[PDB]
């Protein structure tokens, strides 16, 4: 009584609406930190002028 | 996974009585085991159940009091204690198994379970 386990499973069948389907979640942060930018985007380099 | 019980057999009422019951492959570190009863002609019937991470126990109203249900995770056993046995309890025991983790202990009483064991009779004179 006023006791409970804090976690609970999710109910996943094929039948189930697409609200309760299974979803896979990336969450991308981006970040600027005290250091070298290190993850770039392929657009391509130049020569200096 | 497979469910394997021991420890039935003939008891005079009001002895206690050991139920084991070996649970193993997989064992989830936050699932549950219960043990069921079904008697010859009657329904299934919710007896224990006890919640492998901390151990908290729910009993059916029938035994609560008397039946204690334990298990020893290092050893990945769990039991039922049959204290007070009495005519009404002779019935075949199943223990078994939750994969579905609930945050309410009560709706394991009525959840159907994945897997069973053999189930092992004790019979109460």
């Known amino acids: 009584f006023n006791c409970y386990f804090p976690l609970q499973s999710y109910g996943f069948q094929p039948t189930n609406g697409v609200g309760y389907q299974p979803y896979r979640v990336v969450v991308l942060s981006f970040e600027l930190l005290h250091a070298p930018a290190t993850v770039c985007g392929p657009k391509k380099s130049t020569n200096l002028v | 996974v497979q469910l394997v019980e021991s420890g039935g057999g003939l008891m005079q009422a009001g002895g206690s009585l050991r139920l084991s019951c070996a649970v193993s492959?997989?064992?989830?570190?936050?699932?549950?085991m219960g043990w069921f009863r079904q008697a010859p002609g009657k329904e299934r019937e919710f007896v224990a159940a006890i919640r492998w991470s901390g151990g908290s126990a729910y009993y059916a109203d029938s035994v609560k009091g008397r039946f204690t249900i334990s298990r020893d995770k290092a050893k990945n056993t769990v039991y039922l204690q049959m204290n007070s046995l009495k005519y009404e309890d002779t019935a075949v025991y199943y223990c078994?198994?939750?994969?579905?983790?609930?945050?309410?202990?009560?709706?394991?009483?009525?959840?159907?379970?994945?897997?069973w064991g053999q189930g092992t009779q004790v019979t109460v004179s």
């Open positions: 078994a198994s939750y994969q579905a983790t609930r945050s309410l202990l009560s709706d394991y009483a009525t959840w159907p379970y994945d897997y």
């Open positions: 492959g997989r064992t989830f570190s936050t699932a549950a």
